[PDB]
Amino acid sequence: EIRRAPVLGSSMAYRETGAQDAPVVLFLHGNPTSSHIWRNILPLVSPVAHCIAPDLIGFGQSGKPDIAYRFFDHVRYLDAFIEQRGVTSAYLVAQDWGTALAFHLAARRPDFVRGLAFMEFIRPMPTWQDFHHTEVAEEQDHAEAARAVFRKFRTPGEGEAMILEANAFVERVLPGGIVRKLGDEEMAPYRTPFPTPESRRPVLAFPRELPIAGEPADVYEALQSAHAALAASSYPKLLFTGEPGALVSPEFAERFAASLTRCALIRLGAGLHYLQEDHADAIGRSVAGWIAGIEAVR
Amino acid sequence: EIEIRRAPVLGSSMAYRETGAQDAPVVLFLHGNPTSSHIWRNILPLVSPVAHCIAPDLIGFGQSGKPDIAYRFFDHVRYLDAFIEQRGVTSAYLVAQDWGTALAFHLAARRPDFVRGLAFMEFIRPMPTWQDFHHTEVAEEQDHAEAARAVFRKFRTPGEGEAMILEANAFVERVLPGGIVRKLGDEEMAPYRTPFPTPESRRPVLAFPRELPIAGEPADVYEALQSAHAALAASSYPKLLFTGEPGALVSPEFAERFAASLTRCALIRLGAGLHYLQEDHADAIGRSVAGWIAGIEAVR
Ligand SMILES: OC[C@H]1O[C@@](CO)(O[C@H]2O[C@H](CO)[C@@H](O)[C@H](O)[C@H]2O)[C@@H](O)[C@@H]1O
Ligand SMILES: OC[C@H]1O[C@@](CO)(O[C@H]2O[C@H](CO)[C@@H](O)[C@H](O)[C@H]2O)[C@@H](O)[C@@H]1O
Ligand SMILES: OC[C@H]1O[C@@](CO)(O[C@H]2O[C@H](CO)[C@@H](O)[C@H](O)[C@H]2O)[C@@H](O)[C@@H]1O
Ligand SMILES: [Cl-]
Numbered sequence: 098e099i100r101r102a103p104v105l106g107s108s109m110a111y112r113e114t115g116a117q118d119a120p121v122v123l124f125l126h127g128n129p130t131s132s133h134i135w136r137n138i139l140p141l142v143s144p145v146a147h148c149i150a151p152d153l154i155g156f157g158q159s160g161k162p163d164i165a166y167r168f169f170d171h172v173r174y175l176d177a178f179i180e181q182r183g184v185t186s187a188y189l190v191a192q193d194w195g196t197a198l199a200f201h202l203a204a205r206r207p208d209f210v211r212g213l214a215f216m217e218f219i220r221p222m223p224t225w226q227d228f229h230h231t232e233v234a235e236e237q238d239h240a241e242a243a244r245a246v247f248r249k250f251r252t253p254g255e256g257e258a259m260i261l262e263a264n265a266f267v268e269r270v271l272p273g274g275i276v277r278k279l280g281d282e283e284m285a286p287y288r289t290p291f292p293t294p295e296s297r298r299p300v301l302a303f304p305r306e307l308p309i310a311g312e313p314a315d316v317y318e319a320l321q322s323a324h325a326a327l328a329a330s331s332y333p334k335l336l337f338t339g340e341p342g343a344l345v346s347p348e349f350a351e352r353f354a355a356s357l358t359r360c361a362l363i364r365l366g367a368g369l370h371y372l373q374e375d376h377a378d379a380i381g382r383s384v385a386g387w388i389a390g391i392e393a394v395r
Numbered sequence: 396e397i398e399i400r401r402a403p404v405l406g407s408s409m410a411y412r413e414t415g416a417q418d419a420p421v422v423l424f425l426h427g428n429p430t431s432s433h434i435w436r437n438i439l440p441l442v443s444p445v446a447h448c449i450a451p452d453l454i455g456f457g458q459s460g461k462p463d464i465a466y467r468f469f470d471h472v473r474y475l476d477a478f479i480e481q482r483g484v485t486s487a488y489l490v491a492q493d494w495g496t497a498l499a500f501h502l503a504a505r506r507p508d509f510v511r512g513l514a515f516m517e518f519i520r521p522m523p524t525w526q527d528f529h530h531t532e533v534a535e536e537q538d539h540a541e542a543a544r545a546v547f548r549k550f551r552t553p554g555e556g557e558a559m560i561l562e563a564n565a566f567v568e569r570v571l572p573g574g575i576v577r578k579l580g581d582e583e584m585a586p587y588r589t590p591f592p593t594p595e596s597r598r599p600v601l602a603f604p605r606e607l608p609i610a611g612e613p614a615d616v617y618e619a620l621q622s623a624h625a626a627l628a629a630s631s632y633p634k635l636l637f638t639g640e641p642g643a644l645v646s647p648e649f650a651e652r653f654a655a656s657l658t659r660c661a662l663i664r665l666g667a668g669l670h671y672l673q674e675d676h677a678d679a680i681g682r683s684v685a686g687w688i689a690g691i692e693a694v695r
């Protein structure tokens with residue numbers, strides 16, 4: 098069921114399933130997706146949880162206010178959505194920019210977080226080498242092409258042409274990070290939120306928010322702080338990795354998980370950035386088991 | 396990844412598959428009739444990242460020894476207990492199907508301090524009448540359920556079961572594929588046959604249906620499993636029950652009421668499946684179990 102909540106004088110669409118008398122799980126998408134990306138995962142988790150999957154402001158079926166769509170704008174709208182829905186605590190399941198939102202939420206409200214399941218996550222990246230980082234000789238080529246594209250996204254004029262005019266994030270980056278080829282009916286709901294250049298403003302804003310080489314400084318610092326909190330947190334964590342992944346290499350995932358407390362690491366196999374589309378059943382089954390286990394003993 | 400090893404047990408030996416970090420919690424995987432640790436082969440790789448996985452072949456099954464014993468349920472209890480002691484396992488998760496669940500329930504009733512959690516499916520319970528065997532509320536399942544009762548009544552009949560199971564190898568050749576929705580590949584089916592090259596080698600396979608707790612017979616097993624089920628109902632350790640549609644020993648409707656009656660039991664619905672759920676749902680079961688263990692161990 099796909100519903101709409103009034104949020105800050107605009108609205109956010111969201112998908113909801115499960116008995117609403119169970120622990121809440123918030124599913125947080127990133128760029129350039131929507132709650133659509135969780136569509137095959139939700140039915141596997143709904144038997145054990147009240148699943149809520151919002152569309153970020155300016156994404157999916159959410160409102161399109163005339164705002165900057167910076168990371169901190171998303172923070173405000175997501176906070177307001179959570180308040181409006183009356184959610185007092187939740188598990189968080191996140192990918193891409195959803196992870197930055199999840200990390201920042203957890204840092205500000207540690208009492209809120211029952212657990213964090215995450216994948217293909219954002220972290221401060223001191224150099225461009227740390228974006229699509231990997232130590233695997235065969236992957237060096239793919240990594241450099243990603244770097245080259247996102248450098249252009251973050252270049253004035255060039256990013257506008259690519260994303261606003263040519264729709265490169267939806268038409269190229271999205272399919273580029275899915276191993277399988279989506280059916281027409283699966284791809285179409287990724288296109289429908291973004292019919293015009295103006296509508297694509299949020300999709301351009303996001304790569305310009307990535308914390309790379311100190312910029313943008315405010316996001317970089319916020320995410321450094323959020324990551325410090327995560328490393329100091331004691332709630333359960335579940336990290337998924339694909340092979341070779343994109344933002345998170347399998348070897349990095351192992352090191353990162355070991356750098357936290359109470360972080361399990363689940364290996365999904367062949368995958369790139371949008372792991373949900375290649376591994377929905379594995380993700381859903383894993384998350385559901387994990388919530389069941391936590392709730393049994395917490 | 397996965398090594399196959401052998402342990403000396405009570406003068407004989409049990410084979411077992413082992414994979415995972417030796418500093419992780421132990422998970423014991425327990426097969427039933429007429430299978431072996433082979434049935435866990437596609438589940439083990441999904442749990443080994445979070446746990447030290449140990450999957451024994453029951454005495455007289457798979458690559459385990461074939462001592463001259465009756466292969467009654469209590470014989471299996473003794474050999475499994477002895478295996479656990481020999482490997483020096485002091486606590487474990489249990490993952491079980493079929494007679495594996497009877498063994499797990501009986502172990503948990505005697506040594507609840509040993510059980511970190513129980514994940515189970517298509518399990519054995521005391522069945523006061525034949526109608527409780529392959530019980531279905533569903534009109535369109537009734538004939539198939541009746542056929543199953545007729546087959547197992549024959550297995551339990553002196554002379555008849557011998558002809559069917561020892562001579563015709565019906566448990567391996569018919570009952571097993573009968574309880575799998577997909578068709579197994581030749582290479583997947585062959586390791587189910589190799590433990591049982593002769594009629595006499597099939598004695599443990601004939602022994603099991605004759606141990607099923609149905610209408611009070613055999614009395615010792617019926618009593619033991621009544622007691623084990625009482626303990627399960629009162630138990631406080633985490634549980635995970637998987638169900639297929641329609642299943643075989645456990646109907647979806649029965650599963651839902653059963654899980655809801657227990658303490659700390661989650662129910663995981665797998666979709667189309669019969670008795671040998673691992674073969675149709677290895678990935679779903681493995682991912683579920685791994686997530687569940689990871690969650691529990693994160694909270695202590
Ligand atoms: O052990 C299973 C699984 O649990 C995790 C957290 O989900 O780690 C917990 O258990 C480990 C083994 O006992 C401990 O070493 C660890 O401190 C604890 O958090 C995963 O890391 C592990 O794979
Ligand atoms: O879930 C596996 C994941 O957990 C980590 C800690 O983040 O290690 C745990 O699990 C290992 C595998 O069983 C144990 O050997 C280890 O002692 C335990 O802390 C990661 O190393 C691993 O990727
Ligand atoms: O809650 C999800 C899942 O957890 C289980 C046990 O695995 O139940 C636990 O959580 C419930 C909600 O917090 C509690 O009411 C219950 O007592 C606790 O065991 C499953 O039953 C449930 O589906
Ligand atoms: Cl981005």
Ligand SMILES: [Cl-]
Pocket residue numbers: 428603604605607
């Ligand atoms: Cl049997």
